[PDB]
């Protein structure tokens, strides 16, 4: 905003603004298992 | 200004705002399972 008046004598007047503001972020994540059973053949027994 | 006498004013004001907000992200999940069975020690392969 700039507001000059003269009657007659001189005025000046000269005014600046500026702002700028950036935000960001970032979340990631991950969770996972992994569940695993086997079991041997072992023909054998205890049949006694 | 009549007739000595002279008057002048001037006003001058302008004003600007702007916004500006953008946001994407994307996530995926994707889970598979097994099960099996053999019915010598050779086979388990």
Redesign the interface.
């Known amino acids: ?8 004598f001189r005025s000046s007047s000269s005014s600046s603004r500026s702002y700028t503001s950036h935000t960001n972020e970032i979340h990631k994540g991950k969770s ?1 298992q992994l569940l695993v059973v086997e079991n ?2 072992e ?1 054998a027994q205890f049949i006694n | 200004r009549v007739l000595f006498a002279k008057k002048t004013k001037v006003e001058h004001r302008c004003t600007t705002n702007k916004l500006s907000e953008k946001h994407e992200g994307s996530f995926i999940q994707g889970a598979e399972k097994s099960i099996s069975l053999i019915r010598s020690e050779y086979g388990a392969a």
Not at chain 1, 1 to 8: A, E, L
């Open positions: 905003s700039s507001s000059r008046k003269r009657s007659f996972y041997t053949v023909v």
